[PDB]
Each structure stands twice: as C-alpha cells, then as structure tokens.
Write a protein that binds this ligand. Structure first.
Ligand code: HEM
Length: 137
C-alpha cells in the first residue's frame, strides 16, 4: 500500500527521484519553463548533472516526508503551507503539481512493481486541494 511505497521509493530514492522527475519533464515538456537549466539535454546528460541529482533528491526527500506525515493520503496543512510559501515555488499554480503527480502515477502503473497507484493519485489530488486552501492559485 501507500506506506510500503514510501519505503520502496526511499530504498532507492536517487534513482526513483531522477526517473520520476524525468517522466514528468518528458510528458509535460512545457514544464521546463520552470527549470531552464534542464533544457536541451538528454536524460543521460541530466543524470550526470550535479544540480539535477541534488534537486530531484531534495524534492523527493521532502515529498516522501509529506506522504509519510499524511493520514489516509491526506497531507498535513502545515506541509501544504510550506510548499506554497517556499520562495522557490512563487508563481506556481496547482496545475503544475497535478502534472507532477500525473507523471508519478503513470510511472508507477508502467512499473513492474506493485505500487499502490490509486493511493498516489488520491494523495496528489488531496495535496492539490490543500495547496489551494493554503493560497496557491
Ligand atoms: C510535492 C511536490 C514538490 C515538492 C515536495 C517540492 C520540493 C522542492 C524543494 C525541496 C526544493 C528545493 C530544492 C532546490 O532548490 O533545487 C524545490 C525547488 C524548486 N521547485 Fe519544487 N517541489 C514540488 C513541486 C514542484 C513543482 C510541481 C514545480 C514546478 C512545476 C516546482 C518548482 C520548483 C522550482 C523551480 C524550484 C527551484 C529549483 C532551482 O532553483 O534549482 N516544484 N522544490
């Protein structure tokens, strides 16, 4: 289930973080507007970039904490507020987060592993709702 998936992702987090974030950037190419440093590079090139590895790891470290602190896939309001107020997230809208979780869920469904993809879909929808409640447009 959801709680085991958090453990699975954490057990190989740098790899999952890079592969899911690449799935996001490749499924939604326009999202690179927010990550100009990753324009014009193949996946293998990004996976050799220190900034790419460190960004994706820090993102998924925090995402897994938010997932771990949720109850029944409902995130804490404090975690939603943090994500909205982070200076790095100024100007983002909830659609950006919807797209990240669409890619995450599709990655899980295409994976050979028994991820609880429906729970991650629900978690993403509930996080989007909480971000909106916390003031993200
Ligand atoms: C639950 C989802 C997300 C989490 C947990 C998260 C977390 C983080 C963290 C921890 C950082 C600091 C690492 C760094 O500065 O490189 C960061 C930066 C950033 N995030 Fe997110 N983020 C999420 C979703 C998004 C989405 C959907 C977007 C845009 C589509 C986005 C855009 C950015 C940008 C532009 C930065 C600054 C990157 C840089 O300057 O290197 N984030 N995020």
């Amino acid at each position: 289930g959801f709680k085991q998936d958090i453990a699975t992702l954490r057990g190989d987090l740098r790899t999952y973080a890079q592969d899911i974030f690449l799935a996001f950037l490749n499924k939604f190419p326009d999202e690179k507007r927010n990550f100009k440093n990753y324009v014009g590079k193949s996946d293998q090139e990004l996976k050799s970039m220190a900034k790419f590895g460190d960004h994706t790891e820090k993102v998924f470290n925090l995402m897994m904490e938010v997932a771990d602190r949720a109850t029944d896939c409902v995130p804490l309001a404090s975690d939603a507020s943090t994500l909205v107020q982070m200076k790095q997230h100024s100007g983002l809208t909830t659609g950006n987060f919807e797209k990240l979780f669409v890619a995450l869920v599709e990655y899980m469904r295409a994976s050979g592993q028994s991820f609880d993809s429906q729970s991650w879909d629900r978690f993403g929808k509930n996080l989007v709702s909480a971000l909106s409640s916390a003031g993200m447009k």
